[PDB]
Amino acid sequence: MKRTWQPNRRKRAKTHGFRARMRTPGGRKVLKRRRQKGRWRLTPAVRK
Template sequence: MKRTYQPSKTKRRRTHGFRVRRKTKGGRKIMKNRMRKKRTRITIS
């Protein structure tokens, strides 16, 4: 049986990357919260 998680750098970047997060209001909210927490990595890539 195949597992559900098949890691791929490209797919990861396209769904959770900086440009994708910036596009939506919800994504910007996530980034803002992470900046507030002073995370070193705000998003992937």
């Protein structure tokens, strides 16, 4: 049957992307935390 992950690159970047996080107080706190933890990727990689 139809499962829950239906990848869509525009949807991915527009929802979890770097510019989406920067628009928003909670989004900027995500980037702050992921940089503080040392994450290699701050945001999901999307092909574009």
